[PDB]
């Protein structure tokens, strides 16, 4: 009902269409990539500094790691949108590792169309320190897109790409891209 053909455009990128979305995956260094939102996956603290959660924080740089700290202590959130410091990016989205991954990238998608935005790089949300399986992880990744699209709610939303530290959880959203394909 809405996937098209899984493809090559560059060595080590895979896409497909979801609706009219492209949806792209590769592996690499997510603080590299331009997009109108990158997303962080982090602690319930949104002040966690290892893996992915590290490069962000460097590079993004400490106005970014002192605006967390601000909205962290104000309410409790399931997710918060800082500026892009020194990445290349209109807003850096925080979301909790550890909480269900289909919902997390839910809101990405809802805040993203709130904004206008056209693109959005995200990694593989859960598979550090929260410790979920890349499987599971690259299911729900790709089902929040599929609701997205089948709500009618896609109209600024244009690519979204998972840029995913490790090689072998590249093979495993690679698998389940093929698993859709029409
Ligand atoms: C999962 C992941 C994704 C990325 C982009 N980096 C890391 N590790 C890292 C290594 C060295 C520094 N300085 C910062 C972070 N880990
Ligand atoms: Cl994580
Ligand atoms: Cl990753």
């Known amino acids: 009902m809405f996937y098209g053909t899984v493809s090559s455009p ?3 990128v895979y896409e497909m269409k979801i609706g009219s979305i492209i949806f792209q995956v590769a592996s690499g260094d997510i603080t590299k990539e331009e997009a109108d939102v990158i997303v962080n996956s982090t602690s319930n603290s949104f002040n966690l ?3 992915v959660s590290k490069a962000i924080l460097e ?3 400490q106005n970014v790691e002192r605006e967390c700290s601000q909205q962290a202590q104000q309410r409790k959130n399931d997710y918060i949108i800082t500026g ?6 209109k807003n850096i989205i925080h979301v909790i590792g550890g909480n269900d991954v289909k919902s997390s990238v839910s809101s990405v998608l809802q805040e993203c169309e709130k904004k206008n935005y056209s693109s959005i790089c995200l990694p593989a949300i859960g598979t550090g320190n929260a410790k979920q399986h890349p499987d599971k992880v690259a299911e729900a990744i790709i089902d929040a897109i599929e609701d997205f699209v089948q709500k009618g709610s896609a109209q600024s939303v244009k690519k ?3 840029v995913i530290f490790l090689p072998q959880v590249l093979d ?3 698998a389940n891209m093929k698993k859709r394909e029409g």
Do not use: I, N, P, T
């Not at 892009?84 to 990016?89: E, N």
């Open 49 to 51: 500094k290892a893996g």
């Open 10 to 12: 560059d060595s080590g």
């Open 172 to 174: 495993v959203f690679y």
């Open 160 to 162: 979204v790409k998972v």
């Open 59 to 61: 590079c993004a740089g």
């Open 84 to 89: 892009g410091g020194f990445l290349r990016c």
